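P.,

For your records, the input lines for the assembly:
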Amino acid sequence: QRCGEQGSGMECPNNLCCSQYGYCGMGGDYCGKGCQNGACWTSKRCGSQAGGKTCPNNHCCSQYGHCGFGAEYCGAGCQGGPCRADIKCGSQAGGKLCPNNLCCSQWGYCGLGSEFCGEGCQNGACSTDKPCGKDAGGRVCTNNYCCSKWGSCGIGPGYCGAGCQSGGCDG
Amino acid sequence: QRCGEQGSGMECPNNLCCSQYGYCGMGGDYCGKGCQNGACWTSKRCGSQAGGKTCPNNHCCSQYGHCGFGAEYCGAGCQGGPCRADIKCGSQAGGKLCPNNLCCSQWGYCGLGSEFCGEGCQNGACSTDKPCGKDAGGRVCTNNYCCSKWGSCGIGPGYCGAGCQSGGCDG
Ligand SMILES: CC(=O)N[C@@H]1[C@@H](O)[C@H](O[C@@H]2O[C@H](CO)[C@@H](O)[C@H](O)[C@H]2NC(C)=O)[C@@H](CO)O[C@H]1O
Ligand SMILES: CC(=O)N[C@@H]1[C@@H](O)[C@H](O[C@@H]2O[C@H](CO)[C@@H](O)[C@H](O)[C@H]2NC(C)=O)[C@@H](CO)O[C@H]1O
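Structure tokens returned:
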């Protein structure tokens, strides 16, 4: 229910602004001074100009590094987010990973959904669920995901904690 | 710090999935069945195929009524989300509002950022707080937002509750 620093990076639906006090709504109250994410009145900084401050809410990052949507944003120079250009990745990149847990298709391109996350997926939120660990040649996960005690990649206590074989374990 | 139903329609950062228990992670335990938003293994339907629904986390809704990212979702047919084609709106498009609280620029195109939200903005999260209520001719906000006591539009208990001049006022 809470957002931003107060809600654990949590985001408001439909681009509602996360006021400085971790709540959701529209208006100067939530969108003005303070705003942590959502349709903030002052567009955030990102990537090049911000060292990789990727845009939250799956917003596009412009060539100047401000978060938003629109041709100006998602169009050319788009440094991140749902850009209109095709974002490559994978073996064909020298092994490169998609941003914001995006799946890298067999074809070497970022996206979300069956075609991207399904069979052949190279990194990101791949739904193939390939097992890792001791019982799998010692396969490690991509994106530094936690290889759970049951040889499964994920992120969370169930994965990163008790018996986390590899990745971002909590021990 | 709860998502989905367990957290007031909240979404997780970086495309992490919201399990059936209201928590954020990556893995069949967050992304598998139960997943409420985020990079769900079984994409959420949307658009005409799904009664006009919008995609969580600002995902494109492909022409087939499935949410995701990449050419197939954001390219052609894209019935919603950060569509690759400039979304049209306003006095130009028959008063058509931008979906997911996007700002309809004066040039009739949905986006987020100074260019769309700033001066001219026709609807959505416009950073211009044009006065509403008796405070200024009895003006009414766009998107069914609540005009508060002060004569300023927005969403929250502070705009929709006590002294809300018009809009989706609570009371
Ligand atoms: C110093 C300056 O204003 N440089 C301009 C860029 O910042 C500007 O990008 C836009 O900057 C605005 C801040 O003044 C942002 O609100 C806005 O979101 C951002 N727009 C984009 C698409 O990144 C560019 C382009 O208008 O011009 C420079 O001169
Ligand atoms: C009516 C129908 O079945 N049309 C087919 C589409 O469903 C199908 O699109 C893909 O469907 C998959 C599940 O059946 C989804 O995983 C996938 O996201 C979806 N693709 C898009 C872009 O939404 C396509 C094949 O991709 O064929 C149609 O005939």
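Two observations worth noting. Residues A 43, 62, 64, 66, 68, 72-73; B 113-114 surround ligand 1 (CB under 6 Å). Chain A has four domains: 2-42, 43-85, 86-128, 129-171.

Regards
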